[PDB]
Design a binder for these strands. Structure first.
Ligand SMILES: [Mg+2]
Ligand SMILES: [Mg+2]
Ligand SMILES: [Mg+2]
Ligand SMILES: [Mg+2]
Ligand SMILES: [Mg+2]
Ligand SMILES: [Mg+2]
Ligand SMILES: [Mg+2]
Ligand SMILES: [Mg+2]
Ligand SMILES: [Mg+2]
Ligand SMILES: [Mg+2]
Ligand SMILES: [Mg+2]
Ligand SMILES: [Mg+2]
Ligand SMILES: [Mg+2]
Ligand SMILES: [Mg+2]
Ligand SMILES: [Mg+2]
Ligand SMILES: [Mg+2]
Ligand SMILES: [Mg+2]
Ligand SMILES: [Mg+2]
Ligand SMILES: [Mg+2]
Ligand SMILES: [Mg+2]
Ligand SMILES: [Mg+2]
Ligand SMILES: [Mg+2]
Ligand SMILES: [Mg+2]
Ligand SMILES: [Mg+2]
Ligand SMILES: [Mg+2]
Lengths: 88, 66, 117, 70, 272, 104
RNA sequence: CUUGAGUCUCGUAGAGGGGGGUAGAAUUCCAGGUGUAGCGGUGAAAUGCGUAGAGAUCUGGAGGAAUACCGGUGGCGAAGGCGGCCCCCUGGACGAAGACUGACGCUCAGGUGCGAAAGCGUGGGGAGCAAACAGGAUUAGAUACCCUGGUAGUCCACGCCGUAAACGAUGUCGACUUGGAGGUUGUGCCCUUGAGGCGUGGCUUCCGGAGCUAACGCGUUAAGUCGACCGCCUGGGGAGUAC
């Protein structure tokens, strides 16, 4: 999983405030970091289907959240996906 | 009776052969929880400990001559 | 020709047959006997009595060696498992230790399939 | 089931201890069960049946057998 | 990787290439080359002594180091190379003192890797140590038979030997044929399996490929005339003979090992 | 850093080599900035069953805070050194410094 | 806006998954010692093995597979499924207090993924078991049941297949509605005075009320009272077959 300090750093970066954790941008960033981290693991372990299920859930959550951002506030969405370098 | 009740044992230690010998039979087999009265969580912990000890030749796998 | 005084009686007691084997304490066999050779076949050799007479025969065979103490190692599930030891004691050895050495696996090889009878 | 005959222990007594030790160990039962391969499904089914029967019997005895039989 | 060639012609349809991009795309280390002219399976009497050999490509001979005598001086693997003279791939290494040498490439071995022969040498792939030093059970390759002679056993692609036992002056080897063989414990042996394991997965796909590898076509004895072969030839396709070599010795199953000098070393002959 | 707990059993004829060995392993851990939370030479001890036909193995216990790379190296050393008959590197959560029941 | 839904902090239990080591018991085989006519098998036999020394017994070695006891109507997982011990990577569930976002939710035709066992491809491996096959019995016959053997397969790697009484024969999500006895795993208070008293969450087994049901039965884990969405049925056969 993602380490505590790293999570805190992500929160500080994208979080309006350092006690802000629920912000959409923060949530998306955290998911993205987790997904990126897990890439190495799944490259190593292609048959870890259960874990890949967890990863997939993460991906789905990120997509749903991102969609929510798009409908709510377009500028924020554009900035966030430029910051993170995520397609669409 | 459940020896660990007086402590509420913090963690069972595989090196504590003195007490694990209460939880193995003459033949080296692990005693059932129903017979010894151990709580289920502790029983699992103890079983793990016994297995580790057996690996380290602290306890025997079986009652045989050596 | 030799004397040892103290032997081991290995009682292999399968469902079909009982094999008794007296040996020196090291492992070297002195004499043996079976219910089959004792004169029992089928339903008759799969009985406690057959085991007893096999034991008697074995004791007689190792009489040359002059064995006085004897520890018995019982193996397998068998009709004898008791008759043999009783017979041996009657035949007149001091039974010192009685040990069960039935080989149980720790979930190892697959057994043969179940009989449909 | 190791036993060693103590000083001034009769043979019959020694035999009794040996039999008791074997029964306690459960060697015969283990061998009999391991004589043939029980399928996993069969093992599960047998376990379920045993549990159901035991529970039902206990309930029947304690609670159902609290009435005047005659 | 293994790559199935697309069926653009009936010549390519069955071809399976084993393509390894880690090999050196370039010319080999010229000091270690030397001339290697072809025989055509003919001996010094000019007679064909082994049938079915002839032609193929020109090939320089790499001077591979099977002896492995640079003890103590640690080398580093520069690059893997294609050797036409063997199924396995070779590795160009660079010894700290400046000498370069070719060695058989073991499994996993790659450029920049560090190797060392000797007694003190660490137990890791590509290191070479007397077989008394190697733990019993270890998989080894390029094994010597006579101390100081130079590795002879397990040189071919993906091959290896198990050190099943060490009793005194001799280690027992489980050779790749399955054979158990006693070998002197002073015999050198390189840790790990010999590389290019996919060599056997290649499929030549056409007659020409064999020709390129210098293999001339085999003619069945039963195709021939009675004067030519002990399987002669009848009207139509007869056979009725027990199979035999061209020189009339039963083939298929008849054992031919005639060697009493070395039977003492053969702990168990291969099976299967 | 993960708290480990190593216990290794040594061939009793090589019991005289044990002090040097302990020093070497500890030295490596410290070199790699590894802490050493407890270190108990239990000494020669009667085995519950014969290992490699030999009885009475020499037990050493070592609870350590080290990096996992160094733990791996230690394990490798154990496996290849034909002196240590058995070993058992076992992860632990905290600084279990208090003395063991076998010394107690 | 914060009650649904999610994020963060700290812990908890777990055969959850992937990779790599290792342990002991047992079977098989191999070599050797002791030893002698039986062993094996069955309802009873025979085939089979053994005087070319078997079976029994002790020592050593090889190798493969599976993890006794613990073990539980116990636990984990979406389901399939998961069981020695150790390490490395890794997913989820749950509780505590708060803090944060602010409806971001539910369901889902097409689509995509996962999916026991058997089966298939390529390369390994092969102890035990065992379709096929062989011999011996039984029998009217016995292409079976029983016995002695025994090859694919069962194991490993990577692909395919894509189905099971894949069952709780019970689609997912949410709300509401009397109880009793347990199991398991958190947590608050009570002096834990002892294993113990009173709460409050999660999962779980049985019994049972109202209600429901053709009945059997289900019964706060509904088959009760309702809402959203999907899947499916419309007499037996022909047929989950033909094209
Ligand atoms: Mg049978
Ligand atoms: Mg030829
Ligand atoms: Mg040809
Ligand atoms: Mg030809
Ligand atoms: Mg012709
Ligand atoms: Mg001729
Ligand atoms: Mg012809
Ligand atoms: Mg012709
Ligand atoms: Mg013709
Ligand atoms: Mg003809
Ligand atoms: Mg777990
Ligand atoms: Mg759960
Ligand atoms: Mg669909
Ligand atoms: Mg399969
Ligand atoms: Mg296959
Ligand atoms: Mg195959
Ligand atoms: Mg069979
Ligand atoms: Mg059969
Ligand atoms: Mg279906
Ligand atoms: Mg199922
Ligand atoms: Mg259905
Ligand atoms: Mg759904
Ligand atoms: Mg009910
Ligand atoms: Mg009709
Ligand atoms: Mg169809």
């Amino acid at each position: 999983s993602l380490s505590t300090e790293a999570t805190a750093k992500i929160v500080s970066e994208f979080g309006r405030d350092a006690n802000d954790t629920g912000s959409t941008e923060v949530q998306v960033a955290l998911l993205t970091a987790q997904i990126n981290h897990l890439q190495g693991h799944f490259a190593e372990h292609k048959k870890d289907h259960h874990s890949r299920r967890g990863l997939l859930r993460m991906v789905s959550q990120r997509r749903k959240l991102l969609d929510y951002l798009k409908r709510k506030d377009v500028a924020r969405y554009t900035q966030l996906i430029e910051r993170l370098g995520l397609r669409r | 009776f459940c020896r660990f009740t007086a402590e509420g044992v913090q963690e069972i230690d595989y090196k504590d052969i003195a007490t694990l010998k209460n939880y193995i039979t003459e033949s080296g087999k692990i005693v059932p929880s129903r017979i010894t009265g151990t709580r289920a969580k502790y029983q699992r912990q103890l079983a793990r400990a016994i297995k580790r000890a057996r690996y380290l030749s602290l306890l025997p796998y079986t009652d045989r001559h050596q | 020709r030799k004397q040892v005084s103290d032997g081991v009686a290995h009682i292999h007691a399968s469902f079909n047959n009982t094999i008794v084997t007296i040996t020196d304490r090291q492992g070297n066999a002195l004499g043996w006997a079976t219910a089959g050779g004792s004169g029992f076949r089928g339903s008759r050799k799969s009985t406690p009595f057959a085991a007893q007479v096999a034991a008697e025969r074995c004791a007689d065979a190792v009489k040359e060696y002059g064995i006085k103490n004897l520890e018995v190692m019982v193996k397998g599930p068998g009709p004898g498992r008791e008759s043999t030891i009783r017979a041996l004691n009657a035949a007149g050895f001091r039974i010192t230790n009685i040990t069960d050495v039935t080989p149980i696996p720790h979930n190892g090889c697959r057994p043969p399939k179940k009989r449909r009878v | 089931p190791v036993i060693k005959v103590r000083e001034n222990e009769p043979f019959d007594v020694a035999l009794r201890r040996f039999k008791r030790s074997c029964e306690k160990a459960g060697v015969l039962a283990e061998v009999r069960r391991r004589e043939f391969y029980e399928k996993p499904t069969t093992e599960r089914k047998r376990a379920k049946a045993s549990a159901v029967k035991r529970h039902a019997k206990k309930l029947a005895r304690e609670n159902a057998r609290r009435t005047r039989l005659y | 990787a293994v790559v199935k060639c697309k069926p653009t012609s009936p010549g390519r349809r069955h071809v399976v290439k084993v393509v390894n991009p880690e090999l050196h795309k370039g010319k080999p280390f010229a000091p270690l080359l030397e001339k290697n002219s072809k025989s055509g399976g003919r001996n010094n009497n000019g007679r064909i002594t082994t049938r079915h050999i002839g032609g193929g490509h020109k090939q320089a001979y790499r001077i591979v180091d099977f002896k492995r005598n640079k003890d103590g001086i640690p080398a580093v693997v520069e690059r893997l190379e294609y050797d036409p003279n063997r199924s396995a791939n070779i590795a160009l290494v660079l010894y700290k003192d400046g000498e370069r040498r070719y060695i058989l490439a073991p499994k996993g071995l790659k450029a920049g890797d560090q190797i060392q022969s000797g007694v003190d040498a660490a137990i890791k792939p590509g290191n070479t140590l007397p077989m008394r030093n190697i733990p019993v059970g270890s998989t080894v390759h390029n094994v010597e038979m006579k101390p100081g002679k130079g590795g002879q056993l397990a040189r071919s692609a993906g091959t290896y030997v198990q050190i099943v036992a060490r009793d005194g002056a001799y280690v027992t080897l489980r050779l790749r044929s399955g054979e158990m063989r006693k070998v002197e414990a002073d015999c050198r042996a390189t840790l790990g399996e010999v590389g290019n394991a996919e060599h056997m997965l290649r499929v030549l796909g056409k007659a020409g490929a064999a020709r390129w590898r210098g293999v001339r076509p085999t003619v069945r004895g039963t195709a021939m005339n009675p004067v030519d072969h002990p399987h002669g030839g009848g009207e139509g396709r007869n056979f009725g003979k027990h199979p035999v070599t061209p020189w009339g010795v039963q083939t298929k199953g008849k054992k031919t090992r005639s060697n009493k000098r070395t039977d003492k070393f053969i702990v168990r002959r291969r099976s299967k | 850093m993960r708290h480990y707990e190593i216990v290794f059993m040594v061939h009793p004829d090589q019991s005289e080599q044990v002090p040097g060995m302990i020093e070497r392993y500890t030295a490596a851990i410290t070199g790699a900035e590894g802490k050493i939370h407890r270190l108990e030479d239990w000494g020669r001890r009667q085995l519950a069953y014969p290992i490699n036909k030999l009885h009475k193995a020499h037990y050493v216990l070592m609870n350590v805070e080290a990096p996992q790379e160094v733990i791996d190296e230690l394990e490798t050393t154990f496996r290849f050194n034909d002196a240590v008959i058995r070993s058992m590197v076992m992860r632990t959560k905290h600084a279990v410094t208090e003395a063991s029941p076998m010394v107690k």
